[PDB]
Design a binder for this molecule. Structure first.
Ligand SMILES: Cc1cn([C@H]2C[C@H](N=[N+]=[N-])[C@@H](COP(=O)(O)OP(=O)(O)OP(=O)(O)OP(=O)(O)OC[C@H]3O[C@@H](n4cnc5c(N)ncnc54)[C@H](O)[C@@H]3O)O2)c(=O)[nH]c1=O
Ligand SMILES: [Mg+2]
Ligand SMILES: [Mg+2]
Lengths: 425, 560
DNA sequence: ACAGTCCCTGTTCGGGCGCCA
DNA sequence: GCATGGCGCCCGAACAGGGACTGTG
């Protein structure tokens, strides 16, 4: 009784990944060495030498409600070089469903993949090197022999199986929608939370009968609710009186806004500052001014036109630090053509660590993207490369990792995406 | 004896063949050395004489050893390496004494002819062919072909290190409690057994290797407190760098300065306060190793003060996992920072410095933050954790900062220490406009062909000014304007502008810069009492913004 | 209303040196 | 006319990207 494999043709003129390993902490290493000994015992991975010219970094993480360490490979770069494989030859289709469901749960089904053996040729590319503290010894190198947790190509192969494992469950529950994105399974229903959870518990079960494992938690809501997700846009402050400074700033936003919506008119308001005056000096809004203002304030309600998602393009996510622990982001494909826009609040049961927040925020944005387009956005992170590369792993909690990019560009547009409208009480 | 360990399979890059580079002129005297050596490696079976059919070759040569008492054969496989498959290096970093724990007993061994004890993949051997000239060069010498790891190959270092790890795997399993640091063929074995028991294991090990071909000459430290390891002197309770000898000379060449700073920087490990800033400026701009650069004022001085530090030797104390670490940093000089990590107050675990100045305009907080991050990383590499920080910065200063800077930012657990100088923001821009203060509307413009420029301001109190500029950039002018506005400003001023570029630099509260102008703007800002810069969309006809423009862009965009 | 160009700044990569082997 | 791998530092050139003029349509 043999067990087959799918050959993973790598794209022409494509070289494997060669990324140096980033230094891990005392525990991270410890746990990683253990995870690796077993995996090597259970024949999941095998030790390799330096004749193999490839590499990918790895690290570990400890999830919420969980006190077990999970190995995590950053095949992010391998994914990029193996895209035609999992996005064309064998691609998991994204159903517009759970975007709509009232509740979605995410299961770490990924462990299933260890079950199928990985092609022999493609194996060379799964190499990884474990570092040693204070460099006692030269890094140990291993490579997978089975579908690995984190490669987009793994979920591409298992598709054949996973579908069969689910035909039954999908039969008795014709309304629940399940999406498989990498190591995860998004299970969404319109049922009641109590019943929902139960159906989930039933799904976990269904999986066990087919030998699949789903890490369980120490159990101290969690699940995502694609309803309380609301795209909230720009709001022109509303005040009783107005000063030059104010009108200027207002024309600021409005001007910037005219880029998103072309309806914004600034003509009349501009007239108010017709001539060089002092800043604190007060100015009364005229008849034609007040109209225009309100005229504009109205426009900012109807979202732009031409915001049609297009799978053939990347997905870009931008985060703005609003401070006070408040955050804001926009996701788009073409400039000024936002596909969504939300915010991000404070931590419950935790502290206010500037970085960590972004980390949480980034993950937040990512799943929403998964659920909605079944694709990951490219993040433009508002933090220095080092600051971030120093601690994002220390707070990370997802099996996948987005493609980030750094950038600095202050609120020149003077708080272009936050709270402004507050008149006297 | 060669080794019984499986060879690592190696190949040349596709489409490429072996090297056929001829042997170059060698010292008749030197040759002796190689001929001597090759006769040995021959009987030992490490290399082999080869026939006429082998078309490959590669120039070889010798070089004095550690004690110049012998010679190490080297090969110039530079041409081979380029035609050889890539390898992933398994050497990730370098051990460090400060990351070492105490052990009742210690020993350190080395492997005689280490490379030369690891079999070289068979089929690859062809290309390792070379040629040894005759003592008088009458007729072709002997053509030899390596059978073991040859020095000067991409593959040797990584092959060995990987193979040397496989060898130590069994041994390591059986004695989990022994500690073995392996850098190449260099072994440091430390345990908590008794001197005698120790020697035993060491005998197992030394023998264990011997079964694998890893010979072990009696030139390995046994019962000696001063352990010579990785360039350090390892003592029972303390350690230090090995004799560090700064060069002493009247005039210096570019290269001489390098050797210097590299020496001094290697001393920064434990010798606190070492600075190479100025000394480094000497090698600014394209130069040549030979060129003889002159030691300026500072440099002469720095090298001096830096020379008076290496006078009284220092020591570092080993690592105790039983108590969290501490890293303290202080502001050395403008841009420069030095730190030291310890567990006990006076007993420095290790020291260092951080001078890298990143960016055009920054300030101290940001640089301070950089060091924190630099050390944090370096700490995880050595100890695996992040230490607690003692920083010369007001808890209040920082909070203001991270809660006002637009980028995400953070420092780990840290406590304030009042050890001057102290980091602080030198001024803050007002959140709201200041009542009853001259409101300067400022701009400037320039011709990207004539390079001429007018930077001007105009206020609500009817005051006005424009200055002409020789060769400037449309950006700088906008800067100049704000300068003028700040010069001619009062003590409380309002400045509106259309230049994000400008506005941008200023909003991050800089306290340093490579830009002359900015330092002036900086200086001027400190002196101020209540500043407030505003922004306004250019060419939008707003308030005074409209006017200044009209002015400053007078003779640069009139007609074509 | 959209390329083509310029200024300015940031990141990577290569050279030299130090240190270990 | 003199090699290899690894890390560190410093320097500067090369390449990238983003806002703002500029010219032509
Ligand atoms: C510094 C340096 C290192 N390396 C690479 C290649 C080299 N591996 N080898 N072979 C490995 C370890 O460096 P190491 O500094 O240990 O040199 P190596 O191992 O080559 O020789 P080693 O230094 O260990 O030998 P010595 O310390 O000079 O002498 C040891 C003594 O032991 C006796 N001895 C050694 N071998 C034998 C034998 N087979 N039979 C009898 N006596 C022996 C002999 O009397 C000699 O004085 O790093 C390199 O390529 N270039 C370099 O510049
Ligand atoms: Mg040796
Ligand atoms: Mg301007």
């Amino acid at each position: 009784s043999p067990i087959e494999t799918v050959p993973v043709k790598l794209k022409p003129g494509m070289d494997g990944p060669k990324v140096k390993q980033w230094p891990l902490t005392e525990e991270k290493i410890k746990a990683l060495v253990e995870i690796c000994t077993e995996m090597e015992k259970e024949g999941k991975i095998s030790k390799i030498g330096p004749e193999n010219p490839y590499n990918t970094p790895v690290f570990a993480i400890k999830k919420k409600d969980s006190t077990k360490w999970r190995k995590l490979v950053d095949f992010r770069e391998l994914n990029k070089r193996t895209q035609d494989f999992w996005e064309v030859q064998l691609g998991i289709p994204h159903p517009a469903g759970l975007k709509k469901k009232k509740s979605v749960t995410v299961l770490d089904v990924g462990d299933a993949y260890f079950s199928v053996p990985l092609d022999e040729d493609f194996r060379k590319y799964t190499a990884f090197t474990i570092p040693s503290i204070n460099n006692e010894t030269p890094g140990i190198r291993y490579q997978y022999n089975v579908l690995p947790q984190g490669w987009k190509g793994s979920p591409a192969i298992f598709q054949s199986s996973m579908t069969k494992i689910l035909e039954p469950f999908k039969k008795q529950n014709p309304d629940i929608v399940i999406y498989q994105y990498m190591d995860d399974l998004y299970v969404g229903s319109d049922l009641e939370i109590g019943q929902h959870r139960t159906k989930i518990e039933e799904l976990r079960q269904h999986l066990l009968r087919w030998g699949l494992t789903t890490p369980d938690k120490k159990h101290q809501g969690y699940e995502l609710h694609p309803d309380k997700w609301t795209v909230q846009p720009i709001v022109l402050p509303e005040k009783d009186s107005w000063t030059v400074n104010d009108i200027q700033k207002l024309v600021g936003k409005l001007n910037w806004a005219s880029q998103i919506y072309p309806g914004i008119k600034v003509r009349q308001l501009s007239k108010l500052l017709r001539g060089t005056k002092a800043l604190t000096e007060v100015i009364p809004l005229t008849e034609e001014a007040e109209l225009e203002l309100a005229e504009n304030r109205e426009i900012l309600k109807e979202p732009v036109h031409g915001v049609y998602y297009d799978p053939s393009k990347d997905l870009i996510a931008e985060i703005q630090k609003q401070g006070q622990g408040q955050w804001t982001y926009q996701i788009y494909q073409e400039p000024f053509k936002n596909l969504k826009t939300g915010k991000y609040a404070r931590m419950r049961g935790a502290h206010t660590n500037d970085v960590k927040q972004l980390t949480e925020a980034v993950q937040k944005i990512t799943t929403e993207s998964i659920v909605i387009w079944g694709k990951t956005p490219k993040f433009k992170l508002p933090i220095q490369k080092e600051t971030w590369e120093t601690w994002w792993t220390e707070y990370w909690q997802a099996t996948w990792i987005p493609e980030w990019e750094f950038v600095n560009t202050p609120p020149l547009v003077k708080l272009w995406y936050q709270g402004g409208h507050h008149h006297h009480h | 004896p060669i080794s019984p360990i499986e060879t690592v399979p190696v190949k040349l890059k596709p489409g490429m063949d072996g090297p056929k580079v001829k042997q170059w002129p060698l010292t008749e005297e030197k040759i002796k050395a190689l001929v001597e050596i090759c006769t040995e490696l021959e009987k030992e079976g490490k290399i082999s004489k080869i026939g006429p059919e082998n078309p490959y070759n590669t120039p070889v040569f010798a070089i004095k050893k550690k004690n110049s008492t012998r010679w190490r054969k080297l090969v110039d496989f530079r041409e081979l390496n380029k035609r050889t498959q890539d390898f992933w290096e398994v050497q990730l970093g370098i051990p460090h004494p400060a990351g070492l724990k105490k052990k009742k007993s210690v020993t350190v061994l080395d492997v005689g002819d280490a490379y030369f004890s690891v079999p070289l993949d068979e089929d690859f051997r062809k290309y390792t062919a070379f040629t040894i000239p005759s003592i008088n060069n009458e007729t072709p010498g002997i053509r030899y072909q390596y059978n073991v790891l040859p020095q000067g190959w991409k593959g040797s270092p990584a092959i060995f290190q990987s193979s040397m790890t496989k060898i130590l795997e069994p041994f390591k399993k059986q004695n989990p409690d022994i500690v073995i640091y392996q850098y190449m063929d260099d072994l440091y074995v430390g345990s908590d057994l008794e001197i005698g028991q120790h020697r035993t294991k060491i005998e197992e090990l030394r023998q264990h290797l011997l079964r694998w071909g890893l010979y072990t000459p009696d030139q390995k430290h046994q019962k000696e407190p001063p352990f010579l390891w990785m360039g350090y002197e390892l003592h029972p309770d303390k350690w230090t760098v090995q004799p560090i000898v700064l060069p002493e000379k009247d005039s210096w060449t570019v290269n001489d300065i390098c050797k210097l700073v590299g020496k001094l920087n290697w001393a920064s490990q434990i010798y606190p306060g070492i600075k190479v800033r100025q000394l480094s400026k000497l090698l600014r701009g394209t130069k040549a190793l030979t060129e003889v650069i002159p030691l300026t004022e500072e440099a002469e001085l720095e090298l001096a003060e830096n020379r008076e530090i290496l006078k009284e030797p220092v020591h570092g104390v080993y690592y105790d996992p039983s108590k969290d670490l501490i890293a303290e940093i202080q502001k050395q000089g403008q841009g420069q920072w030095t730190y030291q990590i310890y567990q006990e107050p006076f007993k420095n675990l290790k020291t260092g410095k951080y001078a890298r100045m990143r960016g055009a305009h920054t300030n101290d907080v940001k640089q301070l933050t950089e060091a924190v991050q630099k050390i944090t990383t370096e700490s995880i590499v050595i100890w695996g954790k992040t230490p607690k920080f003692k920083l010369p910065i007001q808890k209040e200063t920082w909070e203001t900062w991270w809660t006002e800077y637009w980028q995400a930012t953070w420092i780990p657990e840290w406590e304030f220490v009042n050890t001057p100088p102290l980091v602080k923001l030198w001024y803050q821009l007002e959140k709201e406009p200041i009542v009853g203060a001259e409101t300067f509307y400022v701009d400037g413009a320039a011709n990207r062909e004539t390079k001429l420029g007018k930077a001007g301001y105009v206020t609500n109190k009817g005051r006005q000014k424009v200055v002409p500029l020789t060769n400037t950039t449309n950006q700088k002018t906008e800067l100049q304007a704000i300068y003028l506005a700040l010069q001619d400003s009062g003590l409380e001023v309002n400045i509106v502008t259309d230049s994000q570029y400008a506005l941008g630099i200023i909003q991050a509260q800089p306290d340093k810069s490579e830009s002359e102008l900015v330092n002036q703007i900086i200086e001027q800002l400190i002196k101020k009492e209540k500043v407030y810069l505003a922004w306004v969309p250019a060419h939008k006809g707003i308030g005074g913004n409209e006017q200044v423009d009209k002015l400053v862009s007078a003779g640069i965009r009139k007609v074509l």
